[PDB]
Coordinates of C-alpha atoms and ligand atoms in Angstrom, one line a residue:
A1 CA 24.2 -10.5 4.7
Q2 CA 22.3 -9.8 1.5
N3 CA 21.3 -6.3 0.5
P4 CA 22.9 -4.6 3.6
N5 CA 22.1 -1.0 2.3
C6 CA 18.4 -1.9 2.1
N7 CA 18.0 -1.0 -1.5
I8 CA 14.7 -1.6 -3.4
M9 CA 15.3 -4.6 -5.6
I10 CA 13.6 -5.3 -8.9
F11 CA 12.9 -8.9 -10.0
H12 CA 12.3 -10.4 -13.5
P13 CA 10.9 -13.9 -12.9
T14 CA 10.7 -16.2 -15.9
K15 CA 7.3 -17.9 -16.7
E16 CA 8.5 -21.0 -14.9
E17 CA 9.5 -19.0 -11.8
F18 CA 6.1 -17.4 -11.8
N19 CA 4.2 -20.5 -11.0
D20 CA 4.9 -20.9 -7.3
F21 CA 4.1 -17.6 -5.5
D22 CA 5.3 -18.6 -2.0
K23 CA 8.6 -20.0 -3.5
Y24 CA 9.3 -16.8 -5.3
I25 CA 8.6 -14.6 -2.2
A26 CA 11.1 -16.8 -0.3
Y27 CA 13.6 -16.5 -3.2
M28 CA 13.4 -12.7 -3.1
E29 CA 14.0 -12.7 0.7
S30 CA 17.0 -15.0 0.1
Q31 CA 18.4 -12.1 -1.9
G32 CA 17.7 -9.6 0.8
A33 CA 14.7 -7.9 -0.8
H34 CA 12.8 -7.6 2.4
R35 CA 15.5 -5.4 3.9
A36 CA 14.2 -2.5 1.8
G37 CA 10.6 -2.9 2.9
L38 CA 9.4 -2.9 -0.8
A39 CA 10.3 -4.8 -4.0
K40 CA 9.2 -4.5 -7.6
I41 CA 8.3 -7.6 -9.6
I42 CA 8.0 -7.3 -13.4
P43 CA 5.9 -10.3 -14.7
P44 CA 7.3 -12.4 -17.6
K45 CA 6.4 -11.2 -21.0
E46 CA 4.1 -14.1 -21.6
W47 CA 1.8 -13.2 -18.7
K48 CA -1.3 -11.1 -18.5
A49 CA -3.7 -10.3 -15.8
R50 CA -6.7 -10.3 -18.1
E51 CA -7.5 -9.8 -21.8
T52 CA -8.5 -6.2 -21.8
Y53 CA -9.6 -3.3 -19.7
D54 CA -12.3 -2.2 -22.1
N55 CA -15.3 -3.3 -20.0
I56 CA -14.6 -1.8 -16.5
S57 CA -16.5 1.5 -16.7
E58 CA -19.6 0.2 -14.9
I59 CA -17.8 -0.7 -11.7
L60 CA -19.2 1.4 -8.9
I61 CA -17.2 3.5 -6.5
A62 CA -19.9 3.7 -3.8
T63 CA -18.1 6.2 -1.7
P64 CA -15.4 8.3 -3.4
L65 CA -13.2 10.1 -0.9
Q66 CA -11.9 13.7 -1.3
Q67 CA -8.5 13.9 0.4
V68 CA -8.3 17.3 2.1
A69 CA -4.9 18.4 3.5
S70 CA -3.8 20.5 6.5
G71 CA -0.3 21.5 7.6
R72 CA 2.6 22.6 5.5
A73 CA 3.8 21.3 2.1
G74 CA 6.2 18.7 3.5
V75 CA 4.4 17.9 6.7
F76 CA 0.6 17.5 6.5
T77 CA -2.3 15.4 7.4
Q78 CA -5.3 14.5 5.3
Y79 CA -8.9 13.7 6.0
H80 CA -11.3 11.9 3.8
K81 CA -14.6 13.7 2.9
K82 CA -17.2 11.3 1.5
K83 CA -18.7 12.1 -1.9
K84 CA -21.6 10.8 -3.9
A85 CA -21.3 7.5 -5.7
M86 CA -20.0 7.4 -9.2
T87 CA -19.0 4.7 -11.8
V88 CA -15.4 4.1 -12.9
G89 CA -16.3 5.7 -16.2
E90 CA -17.5 8.9 -14.5
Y91 CA -14.5 8.9 -12.2
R92 CA -12.1 8.6 -15.2
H93 CA -13.8 11.6 -16.8
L94 CA -13.4 13.5 -13.6
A95 CA -9.7 12.6 -13.3
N96 CA -9.1 13.9 -16.8
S97 CA -11.0 17.1 -16.3
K98 CA -9.1 20.4 -16.2
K99 CA -9.5 20.7 -12.4
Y100 CA -7.9 17.3 -11.6
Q101 CA -5.7 16.2 -14.6
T102 CA -2.0 15.7 -14.3
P103 CA -0.1 18.9 -15.2
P104 CA 2.4 19.2 -18.0
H105 CA 5.8 17.8 -16.8
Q106 CA 9.1 16.7 -18.1
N107 CA 9.7 13.4 -16.4
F108 CA 8.8 11.5 -13.1
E109 CA 11.3 13.7 -11.1
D110 CA 9.6 16.9 -12.3
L111 CA 6.2 15.5 -11.4
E112 CA 7.5 14.5 -8.0
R113 CA 8.7 18.0 -7.4
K114 CA 5.3 19.4 -8.4
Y115 CA 3.5 16.9 -6.1
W116 CA 5.5 17.9 -3.0
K117 CA 5.3 21.6 -3.8
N118 CA 1.6 21.8 -4.5
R119 CA -0.3 18.8 -3.1
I120 CA -1.7 20.6 -0.1
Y121 CA -3.4 23.2 -2.2
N122 CA -5.7 20.7 -4.0
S123 CA -8.1 18.0 -2.8
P124 CA -8.1 15.0 -5.2
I125 CA -10.8 12.3 -5.1
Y126 CA -10.1 8.6 -5.0
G127 CA -11.8 5.3 -4.9
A128 CA -10.4 3.1 -2.1
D129 CA -10.8 -0.3 -0.5
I130 CA -13.4 -1.5 -3.1
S131 CA -13.8 -5.2 -2.6
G132 CA -13.3 -6.9 -5.9
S133 CA -10.8 -8.2 -8.5
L134 CA -9.8 -7.5 -12.1
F135 CA -7.8 -10.7 -12.6
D136 CA -9.4 -13.1 -15.0
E137 CA -10.4 -16.3 -13.3
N138 CA -8.2 -18.2 -15.8
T139 CA -5.1 -16.3 -14.9
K140 CA -3.3 -18.9 -12.8
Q141 CA -0.1 -17.1 -11.9
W142 CA 0.0 -14.2 -9.4
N143 CA -3.8 -13.9 -9.4
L144 CA -4.4 -11.7 -6.3
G145 CA -7.9 -13.3 -5.8
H146 CA -6.4 -16.9 -5.7
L147 CA -3.6 -16.5 -3.1
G148 CA -3.4 -18.7 0.0
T149 CA -5.2 -17.1 2.9
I150 CA -3.7 -15.5 6.0
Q151 CA -6.1 -17.7 8.1
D152 CA -4.7 -20.8 6.5
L153 CA -1.1 -19.6 7.0
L154 CA -1.8 -19.1 10.7
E155 CA -3.4 -22.5 10.9
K156 CA -0.5 -24.2 9.1
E157 CA 2.1 -22.5 11.3
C158 CA 0.4 -22.5 14.7
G159 CA -2.2 -25.2 14.5
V160 CA -5.3 -23.1 15.3
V161 CA -8.2 -22.8 12.9
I162 CA -9.7 -19.3 12.9
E163 CA -12.6 -17.5 11.3
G164 CA -12.1 -14.8 8.7
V165 CA -11.5 -14.3 5.0
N166 CA -8.9 -12.4 2.9
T167 CA -10.1 -10.9 -0.4
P168 CA -8.6 -8.3 -2.7
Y169 CA -9.4 -4.6 -3.0
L170 CA -9.5 -2.2 -5.9
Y171 CA -8.2 1.4 -5.9
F172 CA -9.0 4.0 -8.5
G173 CA -6.7 7.0 -8.4
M174 CA -6.0 10.4 -10.0
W175 CA -3.3 13.0 -9.9
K176 CA -2.2 13.8 -6.3
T177 CA -4.2 11.0 -4.7
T178 CA -2.1 10.1 -1.7
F179 CA -1.4 7.1 0.5
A180 CA -0.2 8.2 3.9
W181 CA 2.7 6.7 5.9
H182 CA 1.7 3.3 7.2
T183 CA 2.6 -0.4 7.8
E184 CA -0.1 -3.0 7.0
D185 CA -2.6 -4.3 9.5
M186 CA -0.8 -6.6 11.9
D187 CA 2.4 -5.7 10.0
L188 CA 1.4 -8.1 7.2
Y189 CA 2.9 -8.2 3.7
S190 CA 1.0 -6.6 0.9
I191 CA 1.0 -7.1 -2.8
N192 CA -0.2 -4.4 -5.3
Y193 CA -0.7 -4.8 -9.0
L194 CA -1.1 -1.6 -11.1
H195 CA -3.7 -2.8 -13.7
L196 CA -4.0 0.3 -15.9
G197 CA -3.2 3.9 -16.3
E198 CA -0.6 6.3 -14.9
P199 CA 2.2 5.5 -12.5
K200 CA 2.3 5.4 -8.7
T201 CA 5.4 6.7 -6.8
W202 CA 6.3 4.9 -3.6
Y203 CA 8.5 5.8 -0.6
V204 CA 9.6 3.2 1.9
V205 CA 11.5 2.9 5.1
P206 CA 13.5 -0.3 5.8
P207 CA 11.8 -2.4 8.4
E208 CA 15.0 -2.3 10.6
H209 CA 14.6 1.5 10.7
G210 CA 10.8 1.8 11.2
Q211 CA 11.1 3.1 14.7
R212 CA 13.2 6.1 13.4
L213 CA 10.2 7.1 11.3
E214 CA 7.9 6.6 14.2
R215 CA 10.0 8.9 16.4
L216 CA 10.1 11.6 13.8
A217 CA 6.3 11.3 13.3
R218 CA 5.7 11.8 17.0
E219 CA 7.8 15.0 16.9
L220 CA 6.1 16.3 13.8
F221 CA 2.5 15.4 14.8
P222 CA 2.6 16.1 18.5
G223 CA -1.1 16.3 19.2
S224 CA -1.8 13.1 17.2
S225 CA 0.9 11.3 19.1
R226 CA -0.6 12.3 22.5
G227 CA -4.0 11.0 21.3
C228 CA -2.7 7.6 20.3
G229 CA 0.5 5.6 20.8
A230 CA 0.1 4.1 17.3
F231 CA -1.4 7.0 15.4
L232 CA 0.3 6.1 12.1
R233 CA -2.3 3.3 12.1
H234 CA -4.8 6.1 11.3
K235 CA -3.2 6.5 7.8
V236 CA -3.4 10.2 7.7
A237 CA 0.1 11.6 8.1
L238 CA 2.5 12.7 5.2
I239 CA 6.1 13.6 5.5
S240 CA 8.0 14.5 2.3
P241 CA 11.4 13.1 1.1
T242 CA 13.0 16.4 1.8
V243 CA 11.9 16.4 5.4
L244 CA 13.0 12.8 5.8
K245 CA 16.4 13.6 4.5
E246 CA 16.7 16.7 6.8
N247 CA 16.0 14.4 9.7
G248 CA 18.3 11.6 8.7
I249 CA 15.6 9.0 8.2
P250 CA 16.7 6.1 5.9
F251 CA 14.3 5.7 3.0
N252 CA 14.1 4.8 -0.7
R253 CA 11.7 5.7 -3.6
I254 CA 10.6 4.0 -6.8
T255 CA 7.9 4.5 -9.4
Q256 CA 5.6 1.6 -10.3
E257 CA 4.1 1.5 -13.8
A258 CA 1.1 -0.3 -15.2
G259 CA 1.7 -4.0 -15.5
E260 CA 4.1 -4.2 -12.5
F261 CA 3.7 -5.7 -9.0
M262 CA 5.0 -4.2 -5.8
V263 CA 5.4 -6.2 -2.6
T264 CA 5.6 -4.6 0.8
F265 CA 7.3 -6.6 3.6
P266 CA 6.3 -6.8 7.3
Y267 CA 6.9 -3.6 9.1
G268 CA 7.9 -1.7 6.0
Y269 CA 6.5 1.8 6.3
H270 CA 5.4 3.2 2.9
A271 CA 3.6 6.2 1.4
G272 CA 3.1 7.6 -2.0
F273 CA 1.0 9.2 -4.7
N274 CA -0.6 8.6 -8.1
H275 CA 0.5 10.4 -11.2
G276 CA -2.9 10.4 -12.9
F277 CA -5.9 8.2 -13.5
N278 CA -5.1 4.6 -12.6
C279 CA -6.5 1.4 -11.2
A280 CA -4.7 -0.9 -8.8
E281 CA -5.6 -4.1 -6.9
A282 CA -4.0 -5.1 -3.6
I283 CA -4.3 -7.7 -0.9
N284 CA -2.5 -8.5 2.3
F285 CA -0.7 -11.9 2.7
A286 CA 1.5 -13.8 5.2
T287 CA 4.4 -16.2 5.2
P288 CA 6.0 -18.1 8.0
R289 CA 8.4 -15.2 8.5
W290 CA 5.5 -12.8 9.2
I291 CA 4.3 -14.6 12.4
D292 CA 7.0 -13.0 14.6
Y293 CA 6.1 -9.5 13.2
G294 CA 2.4 -10.2 13.8
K295 CA 3.1 -11.0 17.4
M296 CA 4.9 -7.7 17.9
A297 CA 2.7 -5.3 15.8
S298 CA 1.6 -2.2 17.5
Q299 CA -2.0 -1.5 17.7
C300 CA -4.3 1.4 17.7
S301 CA -6.9 1.1 20.5
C302 CA -8.1 4.8 20.5
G303 CA -10.9 4.1 18.1
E304 CA -9.7 5.8 14.9
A305 CA -8.2 2.8 13.2
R306 CA -11.3 0.6 12.6
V307 CA -10.4 -2.5 10.6
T308 CA -11.8 -5.7 9.1
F309 CA -13.3 -8.3 11.3
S310 CA -10.6 -10.7 10.1
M311 CA -8.1 -8.9 12.3
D312 CA -9.9 -9.9 15.5
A313 CA -8.6 -13.4 15.3
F314 CA -5.1 -12.3 14.6
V315 CA -5.0 -10.1 17.7
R316 CA -6.8 -12.7 19.7
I317 CA -4.4 -15.5 18.9
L318 CA -1.1 -13.7 18.5
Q319 CA -1.6 -10.9 21.0
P320 CA -3.9 -12.2 23.8
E321 CA -2.6 -9.7 26.4
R322 CA -3.6 -6.8 24.1
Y323 CA -6.9 -8.3 22.9
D324 CA -9.3 -6.8 25.4
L325 CA -8.1 -3.2 25.0
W326 CA -7.9 -3.5 21.3
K327 CA -11.4 -5.0 21.1
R328 CA -12.7 -2.0 23.1
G329 CA -11.2 0.2 20.4
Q330 CA -13.1 -1.6 17.7
Ligands
FHZ401 C1 -4.2 7.9 3.1 O1 -3.7 6.7 3.3 C2 -4.0 5.6 2.6 C3 -4.8 5.6 1.5 C4 -4.9 4.5 0.7 C5 -4.1 3.4 1.0 C6 -4.1 2.3 0.2 C7 -2.6 2.0 -0.4 C8 -1.8 1.0 0.6 O2 -0.6 1.0 0.7 N1 -2.7 0.2 1.4 N2 -2.1 -0.7 2.3 C9 -2.6 1.8 -1.8 N3 -2.3 2.7 -2.8 N4 -2.5 2.1 -4.0 N5 -2.9 0.9 -3.8 N6 -3.0 0.7 -2.5 C10 -3.2 3.4 2.1 C11 -3.2 4.5 2.8
NA402 NA1 19.1 4.4 -0.2
NI403 NI1 0.0 -0.3 2.2
ZN404 ZN1 -5.4 5.4 17.4

C-alpha cells in the first residue's frame, strides 16, 4: 500500500501533466496521496492563474465576518459577527493596520507558536464564501471556474440527472483568520488556490482516522455534541496541534504559499489559519471514488449547518433514508 504513514505529499506536475485535471488527481491517488487527507500541488513554472493582481481592489466583501473566540487557547469555538461591507482595497488596508497586522516573527514555526498562544485574544475579520473567480478565462489548466461539475459526475456514475450548480468561492484573509475543523459538504473533495499574499497553515487528519478526531471533539465540546450528532458540520470548533498530540490523534501540518494548490480528499478533516493578508479561491469537486463517501457522509439536521441548495440533490439521491430529516433541518 502506498503512503502507509499517511504523509502529506507534494507534487510537481509538468506542463504536459497539467492538462488533464481528472487524470492527475487519479495519479496522485495511485501514489497514496489521499491517505493524508491533503496534498500540495505546485504548478509548472510556465503556468499562471492570471496576468496580474493589480485590479482586484474594487471586489466587494458584502458581509465581512469578525471571528470571535471562546474557550481556552488550544480548545475554543468561534462565532462570526457580521460587519459592514467593504471593498478588497479597504480590507487590505485594515489587514495591514497596527491592530490586525502580522507580528514580527522569525519563521513559520514561530508564527504558528504565536497563533496558538494568542489567537483567542483577538478577533480578526475575514471575507468568506464570496462567489466569484480570479482565474483568467484564457487559463486552460487547473482553472477552478472550468472544472467538471459534481452534478455531471453523479450523472455519469449513477445515471441520474440532477439540478444544481457548482461555482468557485473567494476568500480574503488576514493574520489569525481561522478555518475550523471540518470535512467538506457530503465529504466532497476540495481544491484551494492561494492567489496572492501571505501563507496559510493547514492541519489535516487522515480519512482513515477521522472518527478519532470526532471522538475527541465530542469529549472536548460536550454541550455541542449533545446538541447535534454532526456538530463539526457547524464549522466552529478549534483544537490545537498540542492538544491533538496529547490525545494521540494522527495528524499532519503544512504551509501553503501563494501560487500553490491544495487538494483535500473525501473525509479528510482539516483546519488552519492565515498568516496575513491573502486571497484564495476554492471549490468542491468529485471523482468516481467520492461516491461511496457521499453515501456515508454524516449530516447535520439540527439547523445550524445551512448549506447550498445544490446539496439537496446529493442527499436526495445518495441518502434517501436521511433526506426527510435533513430537509427539515434546512
Ligand atoms: C471557521 O471555519 C471555516 C471558515 C472558513 C472555511 C473556508 C476554508 C475551507 O476549508 N472551506 N472548505 C478555506 N480557507 N481558505 N480557503 N478556504 C472553512 C471553515
Ligand atoms: Na505524521
Ligand atoms: Ni475545507
Ligand atoms: Zn447541527
